[PDB]
Every structure is written in C-alpha cells, then in structure tokens.
Amino acid sequence: LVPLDGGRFATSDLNDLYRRVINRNNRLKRLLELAAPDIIVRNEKRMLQESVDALLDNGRRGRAITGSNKRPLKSLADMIKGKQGRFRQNLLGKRVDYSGRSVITVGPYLRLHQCGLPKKMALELFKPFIYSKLETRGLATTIKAAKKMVEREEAVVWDILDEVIREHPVLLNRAPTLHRLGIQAFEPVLIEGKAIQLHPLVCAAYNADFDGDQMAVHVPLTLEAQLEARTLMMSTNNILSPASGDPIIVPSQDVVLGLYYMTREKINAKGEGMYLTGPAEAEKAYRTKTAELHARVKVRITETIKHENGKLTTETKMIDTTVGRAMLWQIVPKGLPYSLVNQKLGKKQISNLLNEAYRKLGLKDTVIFADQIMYTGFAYAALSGVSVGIDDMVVPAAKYTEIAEAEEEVREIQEQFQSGLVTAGERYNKVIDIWASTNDRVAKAMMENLSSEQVINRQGEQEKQESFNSIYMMADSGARGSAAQIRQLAGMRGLMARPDGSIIETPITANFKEGLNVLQYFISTHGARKGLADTALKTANSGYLTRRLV
C-alpha cells in the first residue's frame, strides 16, 4: 500500500480480502462472546468460509467478489497462475538490465560478424566498463568524476568506449524468437546515428525486413557469457539451419539479381569470341569497355579440386564462358570446380555454391565467400540498372482472343442449360473448368512472350535468346516473384472464391496493368481479408503448438 503522485494510494486486492476475513472472524468471535442465536452464528461461519475461499481462489466457489471497479478481486491463486501469473511473467521470462532497442537499417559494408551500433546507445549500455577504464588509466580519480565526464561526452570518453567494445560481443534479438537463430552474437561497430545496422545475410535468419522493424540488444557481462557468445552464438558459427542442415545465410534479392545478371549470356555482344588469359584480363576488358559482361569468350582457368581423400589437383585449361562468369570466379575460393560458376546463377545455384564451399572447404572459407558474393552481387546489381516500367508488363495478344472464345462458348452452354440438356451443377462445373483452362492458356502465352526474344547474331541470321525483361529476370533468378505473380500482372487474375469458399463463375479477366473495375476489386478484397485474418489466427495457433512442444 504505497502512495502515488498527488496523494493517491495504490493497494492490492489481497489487502481487501484479508480485511474481509479479519472483520468476519472478529464478528464471529464477538457473536460467540454474546451467546448469539444459532442462525446468526451459522451465517457468520458461512461468511467466514466464503471470505477464506475468495482470498485463496476467487470465483471457484461461486460469484466472484468485486471491489469498487466492478471487477473481480485478484487472489493468491490468480497471482501464481495464468499467462500473467508469476511463473510465466516473472520467472520464465524477465525484463533485464544492460539492454536496449532500436530500429534496424541495412549495412552492406559490414562483415558477417559485425553489427552497427549507435554511439550514444553503446555509451548507455557499456557505462560501467567506461567508468572502470576511466579510473584504470587515471583520467578520473573517483566514480563521480567518471560519471560527470561520461555525462559531458568528452572525446576521451569516446576513445574509452571504442576500446571497451573492441572485442566485446553483443547480442541481437528480434521478436518473435521462433528459433534459436533469432538471437545472435555480433561484434559492435560504432556508427553515427540512432538505428542498428544489420548485415543483410542474417535477415533470413531473423525474418527481418527494413520496413520499421525493431531489434533488441543485450550486453554479456561475465567472461563466461562473452565466450559463450563468441563460440556458440556468433553469426559466423550459425550458417547452417538446425532444422535441416541447409545453409541459412544464402543470398536473396539484390545479391541474387546481380549474380544472375552478371552470369547471363548474350548473343552477338561486344567482345564476343575474344581470348582471355584469365579472370583478371576479363575484368580489365570489362573496365576498359572492350567487352560486355555477357560476351561469350574463351578464358584460361586454373582450377583446383580438393578430393575426398584430400588430394589437391590443379588443372589449367581453356573454357568457353562469359566475362562476368570469370570475374565472379575471381572471388571463388580454391578447391571448387568451375562448373558451379559456368552457368546462370539463380538462388538455387548460389545456395549450391555456398553448400559446396561449406562441405569441401570449411567455415572460414564459406564466410569469406559469402561476404564476397554479397559484395559482388550488390555492386553488379547497382551497375546493372535494372528497373521496373510499364512497358515491361507485356500482355499477350492472344489473351483477348482466348477470353472471347471462352465467353462465346459460355453463351453456348447457357443456351444448352435453357434446353434442359444439363443441370445447373454440371454447368457450374464446366464453366469453372473452362475458366481454369483459359487462365492456364493465357499464362502459358504470356510466359512464352516474356521468356524469349529474337536477336541478330554475328552471321546476320536471327537467333533465339532468353529475354532480358526486368520482371522476367526477377522471377527467373528467384530473387523476388514467381510465375503466378507475373500471371496476375500481365495475364489474368483468375477465378476467386466467395467468403464461404465457393468459386464465382465469372473470373477477373483483367490484370493489374489494364486495371480492375469496382466489382473485380471487391471480389479480390473478399479473399485478401480472408488471407489476412487466417494469418493472424494461425500465428497464435503456431505459437501455442510451439509452446506445447517445448
């Protein structure tokens, strides 16, 4: 029972329950002292029993006793039990000191074991260490002087902070922590700002995107905790998924797009047919504007294989490849074949490269290779200039003809329905079937029109080339997008379902490039709301299942 600001007092309901019990017990004693009639004594004993039951467990015996808030009083059983009880709110989970929280940005310059930490935030977190080092070197005589210097933010305080966090690991955690990869150890690097800079390659581990996400930071204090963070929880050690064993630091989005663009092949490109001494000469040709990234050349490659028994065999041979493939081979560590890079590199190919590097070379080589891959992918995605435009969404000319044919035979079968040849259910089924078939045909036509182009080769004839469309490159590389989303963008949206689940006969015969009308948008919202609500409830279901399993 403690005073609040303004003279108000804050009390626990246990005080009210105890007061009720004491009052009823004293009344019972007084009644027994007065030689009371039996009925009053029985009533008082019933009231005493009810008060004790309410104090121990309110609401179990009968109507729950409520106070002046018209809300049941909280008893000891409620205090020890429940999601808000002591066990789950204060024993199995706690609020901790030496912790902070900030919005996360992307640091493309960071290494896999480094995280960007604000200077002020680190100053607040590492304050006792700063005091210790400010006294050790004699800059502050006592702890009060050190506190004053830290508060005044002197330059020597910044140097002390830089010396403190040099090899001190820090813990980064993002809610919810679905798996153990949601908490990792990094080496802090002081940055000017208020947002934590995070390595891109750990984002898939954190399930984190930079749209307003916040991350918490913790400071291990004892030597044991620091070594636990360095040895077990460091990001350089956690590059394999504990659920499957597959790599978890695989590149995505810009890195995959850049590695795909650089490793593509173009017909009759500048510098075609040239002979290059190696990756260095390929890079030299690219920087001198002699040859394009996608020019077919012959490159002398020195390639070393580390066999299963440990044999290291080096073979130098001339391989038909592209300039970009050799320039990417310039960063591939020794011990891997050139066939891993002598192809267009999607997400699957880069994942295979990283997995092979881990299986044949180890962890350090894999970490350096991943960092170099991310750097090269970012750089050449920037140099590519890939952009989305309204002309990149090419709607096939066969879509309108297919729609007209489907509508015509729908009219025909409606006429058949008026004749009684078929029932309503059969008509519904075949209308749905034809609309699915027409959607498939339109998607196939759009994909064929989007996946290929005709070019002129050296001899002057017309040759078949894979298209360089930005959306097609994004989908094929596996960076972002798929066939279905391209179908919605440039083909047909398809049949959609009613709120109960039934599929509407008339589908959305319009894509997002042409634009939907009011009815089609309403039908789309019908399913969008369902998806959002299903995600919201399934999150709680998965959380409960995970808690039970743990």
Binding site: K538, N541, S542, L545, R548, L549
Partner: peptide, 16 residues
C-alpha cells in the same frame, strides 16, 4: 488443413 492436422497428430487425438 496442415497446422490443425499437426496439432492433432502431436496430441494423439482420437479420430471421430
């Protein structure tokens, strides 16, 4: 259809 199935599978639920 998948998450509830996993839930009943791990809970040893008796089929109807």
């Amino acid at each position: 259809g998948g998450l509830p199935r996993v839930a009943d599978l791990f809970e040893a639920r008796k089929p109807k």
